[PDB]
Design a protein around this motif. Structure first.
Motif, PDB file in Angstrom:
ATOM      1  N   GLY D 133       0.787  -1.208   0.000  1.00 52.54           N
ATOM      2  CA  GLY D 133       0.000   0.000   0.000  1.00 52.54           C
ATOM      3  C   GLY D 133       0.826   1.269   0.000  1.00 52.54           C
ATOM      4  N   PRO D 134       0.329   2.294  -0.688  1.00 51.56           N
ATOM      5  CA  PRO D 134       1.006   3.594  -0.671  1.00 51.56           C
ATOM      6  C   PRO D 134       0.865   4.278   0.678  1.00 51.56           C
ATOM      7  CG  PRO D 134      -0.427   3.358  -2.593  1.00 51.56           C
ATOM      8  CD  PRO D 134      -0.779   2.260  -1.652  1.00 51.56           C
ATOM      9  N   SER D 135       1.769   5.219   0.938  1.00 52.91           N
ATOM     10  CA  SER D 135       1.688   6.078   2.111  1.00 52.91           C
ATOM     11  C   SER D 135       1.727   7.530   1.657  1.00 52.91           C
ATOM     12  CB  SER D 135       2.831   5.792   3.089  1.00 52.91           C
ATOM     13  OG  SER D 135       2.719   6.600   4.246  1.00 52.91           O
ATOM     14  N   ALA D 151       0.127  30.931  -2.677  1.00 48.89           N
ATOM     15  CA  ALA D 151       0.838  29.859  -1.998  1.00 48.89           C
ATOM     16  C   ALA D 151       0.471  28.544  -2.670  1.00 48.89           C
ATOM     17  CB  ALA D 151       0.514  29.834  -0.499  1.00 48.89           C
ATOM     18  N   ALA D 152       1.080  27.456  -2.207  1.00 44.50           N
ATOM     19  CA  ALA D 152       0.771  26.140  -2.744  1.00 44.50           C
ATOM     20  C   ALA D 152       0.979  25.090  -1.664  1.00 44.50           C
ATOM     21  CB  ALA D 152       1.619  25.810  -3.977  1.00 44.50           C
ATOM     22  N   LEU D 153       0.345  23.942  -1.876  1.00 50.93           N
ATOM     23  CA  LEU D 153       0.332  22.853  -0.914  1.00 50.93           C
ATOM     24  C   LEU D 153       0.152  21.551  -1.681  1.00 50.93           C
ATOM     25  CD1 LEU D 153      -2.899  21.937  -0.590  1.00 50.93           C
ATOM     26  CD2 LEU D 153      -2.989  24.121   0.615  1.00 50.93           C
ATOM     27  N   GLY D 154       0.084  20.435  -0.962  1.00 58.53           N
ATOM     28  CA  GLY D 154      -0.210  19.184  -1.637  1.00 58.53           C
ATOM     29  C   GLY D 154       0.176  17.973  -0.812  1.00 58.53           C
ATOM     30  N   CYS D 155       0.405  16.869  -1.519  1.00 55.19           N
ATOM     31  CA  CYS D 155       0.714  15.584  -0.908  1.00 55.19           C
ATOM     32  C   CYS D 155       1.894  14.920  -1.608  1.00 55.19           C
ATOM     33  CB  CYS D 155      -0.509  14.653  -0.938  1.00 55.19           C
ATOM     34  SG  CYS D 155      -1.935  15.291  -0.013  1.00 55.19           S
ATOM     35  N   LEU D 156       2.594  14.066  -0.863  1.00 51.53           N
ATOM     36  CA  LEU D 156       3.642  13.201  -1.392  1.00 51.53           C
ATOM     37  C   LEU D 156       3.193  11.751  -1.227  1.00 51.53           C
ATOM     38  CD1 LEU D 156       6.672  12.742  -2.367  1.00 51.53           C
ATOM     39  CD2 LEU D 156       7.269  12.815   0.048  1.00 51.53           C
ATOM     40  N   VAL D 157       3.142  11.007  -2.328  1.00 54.32           N
ATOM     41  CA  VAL D 157       2.666   9.629  -2.326  1.00 54.32           C
ATOM     42  C   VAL D 157       3.880   8.733  -2.516  1.00 54.32           C
ATOM     43  CG1 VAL D 157       1.216   7.923  -3.456  1.00 54.32           C
ATOM     44  CG2 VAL D 157       0.407  10.263  -3.183  1.00 54.32           C
ATOM     45  N   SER D 194       4.215  13.091  -6.520  1.00 54.70           N
ATOM     46  CA  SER D 194       3.739  14.245  -5.776  1.00 54.70           C
ATOM     47  C   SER D 194       2.421  14.723  -6.370  1.00 54.70           C
ATOM     48  CB  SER D 194       4.759  15.392  -5.795  1.00 54.70           C
ATOM     49  OG  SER D 194       5.970  15.017  -5.165  1.00 54.70           O
ATOM     50  N   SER D 195       1.770  15.631  -5.648  1.00 54.39           N
ATOM     51  CA  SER D 195       0.596  16.329  -6.153  1.00 54.39           C
ATOM     52  C   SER D 195       0.547  17.693  -5.490  1.00 54.39           C
ATOM     53  CB  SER D 195      -0.690  15.541  -5.869  1.00 54.39           C
ATOM     54  OG  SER D 195      -1.835  16.219  -6.358  1.00 54.39           O
ATOM     55  N   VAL D 196       0.483  18.755  -6.293  1.00 56.03           N
ATOM     56  CA  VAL D 196       0.533  20.119  -5.782  1.00 56.03           C
ATOM     57  C   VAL D 196      -0.648  20.913  -6.319  1.00 56.03           C
ATOM     58  CG1 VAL D 196       2.085  20.841  -7.632  1.00 56.03           C
ATOM     59  CG2 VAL D 196       1.912  22.213  -5.548  1.00 56.03           C
ATOM     60  N   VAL D 197      -1.249  21.714  -5.444  1.00 50.81           N
ATOM     61  CA  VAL D 197      -2.327  22.632  -5.782  1.00 50.81           C
ATOM     62  C   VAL D 197      -1.927  24.022  -5.306  1.00 50.81           C
ATOM     63  CG1 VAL D 197      -4.637  23.359  -5.105  1.00 50.81           C
ATOM     64  CG2 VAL D 197      -4.260  21.039  -5.926  1.00 50.81           C
ATOM     65  N   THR D 198      -2.060  25.005  -6.191  1.00 48.98           N
ATOM     66  CA  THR D 198      -1.772  26.399  -5.882  1.00 48.98           C
ATOM     67  C   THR D 198      -3.061  27.108  -5.490  1.00 48.98           C
ATOM     68  OG1 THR D 198      -2.001  27.007  -8.210  1.00 48.98           O
ATOM     69  CG2 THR D 198       0.203  26.452  -7.417  1.00 48.98           C
ATOM     70  N   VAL D 199      -3.028  27.805  -4.359  1.00 47.87           N
ATOM     71  CA  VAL D 199      -4.212  28.469  -3.819  1.00 47.87           C
ATOM     72  C   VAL D 199      -3.821  29.871  -3.370  1.00 47.87           C
ATOM     73  CG1 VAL D 199      -5.547  26.430  -3.166  1.00 47.87           C
ATOM     74  CG2 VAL D 199      -3.750  27.297  -1.646  1.00 47.87           C
ATOM     75  N   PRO D 200      -4.791  30.786  -3.302  1.00 47.44           N
ATOM     76  CA  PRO D 200      -4.506  32.113  -2.746  1.00 47.44           C
ATOM     77  C   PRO D 200      -4.106  32.023  -1.282  1.00 47.44           C
ATOM     78  CG  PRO D 200      -6.583  32.117  -3.956  1.00 47.44           C
ATOM     79  CD  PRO D 200      -6.151  30.690  -3.859  1.00 47.44           C
TER      80      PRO D 200
END
Ligand SMILES: *[C@@H]1O[C@H](CO)[C@@H](O[C@@H]2O[C@H](CO)[C@@H](O)[C@H](O)[C@H]2NC(C)=O)[C@H](O)[C@H]1NC(C)=O
Lengths: 216, 195, 225, 231, 215
Positions: D133-135, D151-157, D194-200
């Motif tokens: 399984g992924p983490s 700014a930006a945020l996200g997850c590392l799989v 990875s997965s990144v989303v840019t948000v205000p």
């Protein structure tokens, strides 16, 4: 009736250089082409068969490629003994169409040297038997390309000139040339001036050598 | 009725090489040569001892059909009185030949984009072939004085060589399918003849 | 010891006939494709004739009806019979083997002979004439003078020209003979020597011709204008 | 119009054999000049022709791979089978089967040939590993006030096998500025993306972001919430 | 074997102009043995030209081909937004049959300035014995960009990995993620970690740093 054209007619290269020769056919001959090498005074020797296959006992520097209507022979490192003539021969026409190419000659490359010009009018011993020969000589020039014109008392001559040339010598790799006019003594005594004009690459201007019969 | 099976010879899926040509017997049937002669698909339809329009009337004891594949420029060698590699070492016709020869271009079937090497011909043979003689021996050919013991070498060659059929070859080195018909009229009752 | 040896060349009148032989060693003539190939002087190679292992023979169009190729199994030899010879048949002829080589080079000549020379001419063999070419009237000219000999009006080839019985070799150029309009031959042989050597050293010119047995020696000396 | 489809076990253990089947419709292996070819392309590399089979059972193979390649044809059920032996970890690629045909004009002049329609292509991976399984780890945004209102945020799989992984954001309701870089193979034969989303910047605390990861081979569905964290 | 070299490796234009691609062969074969294929992103190749000058069925008139000897060329006159893909030259002259290395056709735009965003490892990963620090370069053109990881002002090497996304479909830009992985003993043995970006659109190298003790 397939005719083969070789390029170039002659090629000058030095030791350790890479050399390429091309053979072209008037129509596609697939891979039925062979490459032969011949040295002066000897029979040809088969180098390449089927345009790509090296024969046993042949140095590995020789290689061949091509197909259809264009074929190439390549020498990677040119040893001093590879200065010979090369032929391409096709075996495509089935019953009686075997033919060779014109041939390409390879010679040693060197610097430019200006020929020395000498002239010899006919002798009295020759004129006892009614012959006139006038000989102009060029020594130790490179490259071979040079032209000689003959002037009978400041007029152009043509059709009575025989020219001979020597192969590259073993110490300086230059050529020599000898031109001669043949005439009858009646054609000789009337005129007074004779001259040979020689033009060569290493000459800034054409060099004349003339003689007047009356003085000497 | 019971028409002769000419479709199993001209329309065969695969043909044989010239050194191992195929022979077929035709008998006990009715033969219509009009369809064969009026077809426009044949580049060569040549025959000698019979009139091409009179085949529908002559009636013979039996027919032989010999089929193979050769080079385009060698079709001229399949004829009485010819000489050459094919005529001398692969397939020989008699000088008093009766019957006739059909040949057509098959470049789309017998050429492969990388080269087709499945067709062979004999190159080395000590003597000429007798008419209608086959030779399928594949023993090493000795061209010198020292006898080799079955191992190939300088003066000992395998006597069969392969064609180099390829779709870009010019007309002359493209494959051709060849069928030769031989008519035998013997003392036995005639069997093969058309309406 | 694969070997091919030619023999039988020579000089014939136009319309004459000749026979050339090619003796083979270690290869069987009756078992190979055997060819005759000729080369004209200064020109390229040209195929002449072929004989098959089974006996078929082929000729080029130029020689058809005049040349005949034959074999001999007892002596292991090849023969070329030439009839109605003409001036265009003057060449060097080679006996060659076709479709050999270790990788089986089909259609290529892998074994060649030494070749034999055939000359067809009506030139009435005769000996050469020697004419001196004296160095011109010049004092030093940068220490460079040239003298020589001209060998004219001889038939047939070859001929040997030597200087001072072989005592002088440096700077000697013997130009190739040229076939003149009358069918005879001519050449020249020159040597470059320093000017100061024109007075003391004695110069001998020797021209030797075997077919006419003509041996001529002469002296080259400057003249005063 | 013709179609070709590849099938077979997409997972191969090292130094065993693989067997792939191509099923085609719209043509038959009984017409003259028709062939079926097999080509492969490694991930991010150039194409490489593997094998070819003709209508008359004539076959051609790449000389470097002829030792361990077999190809067979079944005309009745329209199938072509390719078998390769002694598999290596550098033979992971995408495999295509393509239709092969040539062009002649009533006189056999040959205006060239081609590899017309290709299959969809199947991804084959050859490695010794176990599906686990992924983490997912939340890469929270920087503790920044405005920074120009961006700014930006996200997850590392991390630590998943095998490929692929389907990643969505806000149950797919958010698609503006979402970048999901392709997963790379690590030194341990293990994957990570990875997965990144840019948000205000002002939207950090007013909207809660969820990253959803789905992994069929491990049958894993994980939703990781991402919120800014302070120093 | 025959080796085919395509020129150039990458060719970037705007929608509207003309594109020219070249394929050169190591050996010489007939011109009827060469063809041109096109492949888009995440798709299968489709035949585009066969015989070096003959168009396939359905291919628009924009694509043209011409060649001889050892050099062949493909030309597009009016290229649309759907014409940007990878292109291959393939030969049937001699076995084995080989493709070209490929040429990418890239859309050209204005230079963009990358934006850098830093990420230290989180608790969910800083509990499992391995830590990963990641920094992101965003919305930059062209593709070229230089990344350098530093730990306590020491340039790391060989312990990081890089990933690049495909050319963004709305801005024709790129995004880049740089990851650096260490263990807990390798993690808590230093203080400040940074990554540095170098780009054509940036006047000076830009370094973004973070201290784990402070934040
Ligand atoms: C070999 O097969 C071809 C095609 O199957 C035959 O040619 C056809 O002949 C029929 C006559 O009964 C025509 O109606 C068709 O139009 C022909 N088709 C083509 C493509 O030519 C040919 O007759 C067969 N040969 C033999 C000897 O049976």
């Amino acid at each position: 009736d397939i005719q083969m054209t070789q390029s170039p007619s002659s090629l000058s290269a030095s030791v350790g250089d890479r050399v390429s020769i091309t053979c072209r056919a008037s129509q596609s001959i697939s891979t039925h082409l062979h490459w032969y090498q011949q040295k002066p005074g000897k029979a040809p020797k088969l180098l390449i068969s089927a345009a790509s296959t090296l024969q046993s006992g042949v140095p590995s520097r020789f290689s061949g490629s091509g197909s259809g209507t264009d074929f190439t022979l390549t020498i990677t490192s040119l040893q001093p003994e590879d200065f010979a003539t090369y032929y391409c021969q096709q075996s495509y026409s089935t019953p009686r169409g075997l033919s060779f190419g014109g041939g390409t000659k390879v010679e040693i490359k060197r610097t430019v040297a200006a020929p020395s010009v000498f002239i010899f009018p006919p002798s009295d011993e020759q004129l006892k038997s009614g012959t006139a020969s006038v000989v102009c000589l060029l020594n130790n020039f490179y490259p071979r390309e040079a032209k000689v014109q003959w002037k009978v008392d400041n007029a152009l001559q043509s059709g009575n000139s025989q020219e001979s040339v020597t192969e590259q010598d073993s110490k300086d790799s230059t050529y020599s040339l000898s031109s001669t006019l043949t005439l009858s003594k009646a054609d000789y005594e009337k005129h007074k001036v004779y001259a040979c004009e020689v033009t060569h690459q290493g000459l800034s201007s054409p060099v004349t050598k003339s003689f007047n019969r009356g003085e000497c | 009725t019971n028409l002769c099976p000419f479709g199993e010879v001209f329309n065969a899926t695969r043909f044989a090489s010239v050194y191992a040509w195929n022979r077929k017997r035709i008998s006990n049937c009715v033969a219509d040569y009009s369809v064969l002669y009026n077809s426009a698909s044949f580049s060569t339809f040549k025959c000698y001892g019979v009139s091409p329009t009179k085949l529908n009337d002559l009636c013979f004891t039996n027919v032989y059909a010999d089929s193979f594949v050769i080079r385009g420029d060698e079709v001229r060698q399949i004829a009485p009185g010819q000489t050459g590699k094919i005529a001398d070492y692969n397939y020989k016709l008699p000088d008093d030949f009766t019957g006739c020869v059909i040949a057509w271009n098959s470049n789309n079937l017998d050429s492969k984009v990388g080269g087709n090497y499945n067709y062979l011909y004999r190159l080395f043979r000590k003597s000429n072939l007798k008419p209608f003689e086959r030779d399928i021996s594949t023993e090493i050919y000795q061209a010198g004085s020292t006898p080799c013991n079955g191992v190939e070498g300088f003066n000992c060659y395998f006597p069969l060589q392969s064609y180099g059929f390829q779709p870009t070859n010019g007309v002359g080195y493209q494959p051709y399918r060849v069928v030769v018909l031989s008519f035998e009229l013997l003392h036995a009752p005639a069997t093969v003849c058309g309406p | 010891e694969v070997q091919l040896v030619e023999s039988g060349g020579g000089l014939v009148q136009p319309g004459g006939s000749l026979r050339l032989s090619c003796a083979a060693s270690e290869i069987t003539v009756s078992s190979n494709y055997m060819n005759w190939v000729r080369q004209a002087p200064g020109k390229g190679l040209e195929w002449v004739s072929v004989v098959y292992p089974g006996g078929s023979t082929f000729y080029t169009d130029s020689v058809k009806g005049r040349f005949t190729i034959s074999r001999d199994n007892s002596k292991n030899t090849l023969y070329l019979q030439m009839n109605s010879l003409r001036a265009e048949d003057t060449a060097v002829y080679y006996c060659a083997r076709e479709s050999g080589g270790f990788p089986l080079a089909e259609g290529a000549f892998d074994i060649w002979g030494q070749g034999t020379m055939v000359t067809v001419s009506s030139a009435s063999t005769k000996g050469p004439s020697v004419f001196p070419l004296a160095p011109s009237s010049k004092s030093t000219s940068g220490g460079t003078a040239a003298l020589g000999c001209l060998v004219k009006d001889y038939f047939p080839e070859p001929v040997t020209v030597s200087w001072n019985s072989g005592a002088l070799t440096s700077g000697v150029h013997t130009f190739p003979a040229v076939l003149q309009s009358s069918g005879l031959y001519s050449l020249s042989s020159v040597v470059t020597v320093p000017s100061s050597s024109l007075g003391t050293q004695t110069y001998i010119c020797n021209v030797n011709h075997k077919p006419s047995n003509t041996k001529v020696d002469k002296r080259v000396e400057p003249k005063s204008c | 119009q013709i179609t070709l489809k590849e099938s077979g076990p997409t997972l191969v253990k090292p130094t065993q054999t693989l067997t792939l089947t191509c099923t085609f419709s719209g043509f038959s292996l009984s017409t003259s000049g028709v062939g079926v070819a097999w080509i492969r392309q490694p991930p991010g590399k150039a194409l490489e022709w593997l094998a070819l089979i003709y209508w008359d059972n004539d076959k051609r193979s790449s000389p470097s791979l002829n030792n361990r390649l077999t190809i067979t044809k079944d005309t009745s059920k329209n199938q072509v089978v390719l078998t390769m032996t002694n598999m290596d970890p550098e033979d992971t690629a995408t495999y295509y089967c393509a239709h092969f045909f040539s062009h002649y004009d009533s006189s056999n002049y040959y205006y060239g040939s081609w590899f017309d329609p290709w299959g969809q292509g199947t991804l084959v991976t050859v490695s010794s590993a176990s599906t686990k399984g992924p983490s997912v780890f939340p890469l929270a945004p920087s503790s920044k006030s405005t920074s120009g209102g961006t700014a930006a945020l996200g997850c590392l799989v991390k630590d998943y096998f095998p490929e692929p992984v389907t990643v969505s954001w806000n149950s797919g309701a958010l698609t503006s500025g979402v970048h999901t870089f392709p997963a790379v193979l690590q030194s341990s034969g293990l994957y990570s993306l990875s997965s990144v989303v840019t948000v205000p910047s002002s939207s950090l605390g007013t909207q809660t972001y969820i990253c959803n990861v789905n992994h069929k081979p491990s049958n894993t569905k994980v939703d990781k919430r991402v919120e800014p964290k302070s120093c």
